Amino acid sequence: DTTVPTFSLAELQQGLHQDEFRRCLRDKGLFYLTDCGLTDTELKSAKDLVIDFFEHGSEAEKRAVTSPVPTMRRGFTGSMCYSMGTADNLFPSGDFERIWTQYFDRQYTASRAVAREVLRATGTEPDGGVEAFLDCEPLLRFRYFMAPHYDLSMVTLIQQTPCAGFVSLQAEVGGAFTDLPYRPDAVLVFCGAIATLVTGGQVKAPRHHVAAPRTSSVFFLRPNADFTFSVPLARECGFDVSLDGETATFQDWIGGNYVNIRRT
Amino acid sequence: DTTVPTFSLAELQQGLHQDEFRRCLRDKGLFYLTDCGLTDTELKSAKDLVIDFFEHGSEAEKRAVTSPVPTMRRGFTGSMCYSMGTADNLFPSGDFERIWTQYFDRQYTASRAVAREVLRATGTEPDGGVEAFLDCEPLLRFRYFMAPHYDLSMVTLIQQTPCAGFVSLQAEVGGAFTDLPYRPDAVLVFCGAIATLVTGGQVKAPRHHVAAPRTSSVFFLRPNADFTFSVPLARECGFDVSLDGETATFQDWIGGNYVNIRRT
Amino acid sequence: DTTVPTFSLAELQQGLHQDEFRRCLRDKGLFYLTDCGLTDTELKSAKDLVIDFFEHGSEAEKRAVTSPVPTMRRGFTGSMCYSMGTADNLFPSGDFERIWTQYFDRQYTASRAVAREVLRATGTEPDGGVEAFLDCEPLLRFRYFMAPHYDLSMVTLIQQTPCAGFVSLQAEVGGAFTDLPYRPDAVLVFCGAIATLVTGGQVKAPRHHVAAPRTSSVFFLRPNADFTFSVPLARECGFDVSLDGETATFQDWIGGNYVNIRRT
Ligand SMILES: [Fe+3]
Ligand SMILES: [Fe+3]
Ligand SMILES: [Fe+3]
Incomplete structure (x- = not known):
């Protein structure tokens, strides 16, 4: 069965669907996640004010939130990108900062929460403990619009908005690339290589690619250097x-x- | 003279052709190798049972010998690949395992043997000694069907089967790319950058590329981390x-x- | 103002144009540099004797100045390249060596001199001091004829000769790619990521690319490993x-x- 499954985070946290979840992690390494605090409503608000910036920010305003090295780590990058993490951020305005701090916090909370469930379902205690592992070095990248790759994160959370109905994102599932369209109500989770590593090989890191015929919000939950x-x-x-x-x-x-x- | 030369390993081990071999290593860094224990017969047997697997293995059988991270280090990777080293292997069956363990052992033995002759002809004693250097971290990759590169191995051994007579592999020799077709009776050796390094620059690491208009068995003899x-x-x-x-x-x-x- | 500015090194060394220079470094990270000891005359002499070599050197002569690993670090690489640094060089002849040692020394002196002014204008004292920082690991690459990138140098100095009047080099300035043609009398300086790093983010490392519709001399001033x-x-x-x-x-x-x- 090459369906991409969906899990409720709340249900997972209540101890339900544990064999299904474990099999998903081992055999597929990707799933949609509902009931995790991440709504199309909230995406909509962050998306609107960043599109407003991309559309209508002067270049002086853009330069003020541009890093001196073009790494796409923080701030604006010109398809246009806006990047954030837990500190050292560059924000175009008070209103923007309120909205995006909140949005980032919800993504970070959801990502840590599903990673905690990946670790629990696989019996995994990272060296140094779970909470030091999850208090880490995330990166959020918002893009306004591939060669196939896997992610090197613990998990990656992906929100999308749809095209005017082409489906750009595809992942390998049961040995075929399968569409991964937007879901109103759900975030897409890809397991990364660090999930594979930390769990002793109990989690697949699936290959995927972004096809050319939209916006994407990609949150990488990345471990600390140590x-x-x-x-x-x-x-x-x-x-x-x-x-x-x-x-x-x-x-x-x-x-x-x-x-x-x-x-x- | 831009001919790709051929050496008998046995003759090299008897102390013959030492100036020719040294000049080949310095000026070309590639050669065919005969009398090294690597036969079209043996290739044929390993090739048949892996093609049988690629052709006719269910996807369930393939998933069982697929690593959770898609690194092409061990097991099956879908042009299709099968990879092995000295341990942590993934084998589709008892018969497969017998055949491929044997095949791997012969390739590893031939690779160590020609590397020993590269070191001897160049007067090279690696830090820590020859045998600790050669007891290393090889990788075997079998492919069923480029931008030019050099290999970072000590040596690389390449067996091929021919096309139904297009010649895909080419290497730089005397400043031109030259065909490197299959030889019944011989393995193709490319020196890698570690040969250059360990010998103090006495061995060339030639650039090469795989052209699109077959199968290839590539054995990388790679040093230990230390x-x-x-x-x-x-x-x-x-x-x-x-x-x-x-x-x-x-x-x-x-x-x-x-x-x-x-x-x- | 998206003009690429020009500074006289001599004027900078006399303490002139310091606010303009600082703003250039922060907002653009590139500029032409005059009065730095680097003349079209001198380029001409080095260029003629290396073109003579590329054109008319036998392959035996080329092989003698070819490294055994094809890294484009030293010697000849076949668009053709000639590379040098402060030692371990490969020279085709006595006359070549005189000319290129001199040329390299002038480029290294100019590069250290403008880097010293980048550090001074930004109030920067590198850990370990300025002169240990600038006594470093430069690389000179001459090419005889991209995806956009930034350089990882402290600074990069670029001399060019023009086409028979197409302008290949372009850099991002004020959010558009802008032509960077040859200047008789001037060298082109790009700040690299190490300038950004050492100065605490006071210097931009601009993205740039070499377009296909000439020669280029590129000197990378690169820090020591420590x-x-x-x-x-x-x-x-x-x-x-x-x-x-x-x-x-x-x-x-x-x-x-x-x-x-x-x-x-
Ligand atoms: Fe990805
Ligand atoms: Fe290769
Ligand atoms: Fe560059």
């Missing part, structure tokens, strides 16, 4: 590590700059 | 290292994940 | 570092091999 894991265990589930020794950190593995995606 | 070398010597033969200090490891140089190829 | 910086400060100006701890080195950040450019 996230530590077992090297021989990494080797058991397909990681081609060049790491001496029995344990390593995320920094050891990926290097000194975050890397969000990888191709085969 | 392989140690001299930084100033690396600088003398063209390595643009950013390494503080007088010595470094392969992990220091390449990072926490193996990197098998590099472009200019 | 160049040390503040991690939280790196985070403040857009660097998406995965670095544990309060300070880090360039090697920590970029890895064991120099990386000269980066895309978004």
Whole structure:
């Protein structure tokens, strides 16, 4: 069955559907998530004020919220992007800041909450504990409009708005690329390679791609640099590590700059 | 003379053709290798049972031998790939496992044997000794069917089967790309950048590419993470290292994940 | 005003135009530089003897000045390249060596001199001091004839010769790509990400690209591996570092091999 499933976060938190969820994580590594605090209403408000900015902000206003290095980490990047994390943000105005701080907080809360359920369903206690693992280094990227890749996050949450009905996002499921359209009521979750790693290979990190024939909100839940894991265990589930020794950190593995995606 | 030469491994091991071999290594960095234990017969048997799998394995059978992260390190990857190393392998069946373990062992033995001859012909004693250097981290990748690159291996061994007579693989030789067709009786060896490094610049790592108008078996002989070398010597033969200090490891140089190829 | 400005190095060294220069560095991160010791006359002499080599050097002569790994770090690379740094160079002849050593020295002197002025205008004292910072690991690449990128240098100096009048190089300025043609009398300076980093975000690293419808001399002023910086400060100006701890080195950040450019 190559259906992309949907889970209620609330139901998962109540201990329901645990075998289904575990099988989804192992066999597919993607699902829609409902009842997680992330509404089309709220997306709508953040989306409107950032589109207003992209459409109608002077370039002086844009330059004030442009980083001096064009990394798409914070602020505006000209298809146009707006990026945020938990600090060091660049905001065009008081109203924008209120709306986007709130939006970011809800995405971060939902992402930590579903990651907690991924860890619980797989029996996983990260080295250093669950809450230090989840208090991490997220990145939110909003785009206004691929070669297939997998994400290097723990999980990635994706909200979309639809086209005037072309479906750009596709993921591999049961060995075929499958449409992943917008859902009013739901966020799309992709498991990333860090889920695979931390859980000892119990979670798939699916390949996906964004096709050209919209907007996308992508939240990457990314571990801290000092996230530590077992090297021989990494080797058991397909990681081609060049790491001496029995344990390593995320920094050891990926290097000194975050890397969000990888191709085969 | 831009011919790609052929050497008998047995003859090399008997101390013959040493000046020719050394000049080949320095000026070309590629050659066919005969008398190394690698036969079209044996390729044929491994090739048949993996093609049978690619052709006729259910997707359930394929999923069982698919890694949760799509790294093409172990198991099946869908042009289709099957990958192996010395441990943590994923095998579709008892018969497959017997055949491919044997095939892998012969490739690993041939690769270590020609690397030993590369080191001997160049007077090279790796830090830590020859046998610890060669007891390493190989990767075998079988493909069923480029931008030019060089390999980052010590050596790479390549077996091919021919097309129904187009020649896909080409390498730079004397400043032109030259066809490298299948040879019944021989394996194709490319020297990689680690040969250049370990030998102090006595071995070329040739650029090559796979052209679109078949199958390929590619064995990468890759050093351990703790392989140690001299930084100033690396600088003398063209390595643009950013390494503080007088010595470094392969992990220091390449990072926490193996990197098998590099472009200019 | 999206003009690419021009500064006299001599005037900058006399303390003139400091507010203009600072605003250029912050808002644009590129400028032409006159009065820096870099003449079309001198370019002409180095260019003629390397073109003579590219045109009329036998392949045996080319192989003698070809590195065994094709990294484009030193010597000849076949559009054709010739590369140099402060040592370990490969020169085709006595006359070539005299001319190119001199040319390299003038480029290195000009690059250090404008970097010194970037640091002074921004109030910047690198950890370890200015002169240890500038006594670094430059790379000169001459090409005989893109996806947009930024440079990871401190500064990059670019001399060009014109086409028979197409303008290949373009950079983002005030949110549009702008032609950067040859100037007889001037060198083009791009600030790189290390300028952004060392100065605490006071310098832009502009995106740029080389368009297909000539020659280019590109000098990268690149820090030493042990160049040390503040991690939280790196985070403040857009660097998406995965670095544990309060300070880090360039090697920590970029890895064991120099990386000269980066895309978004
Ligand atoms: Fe993705
Ligand atoms: Fe290759
Ligand atoms: Fe550049």
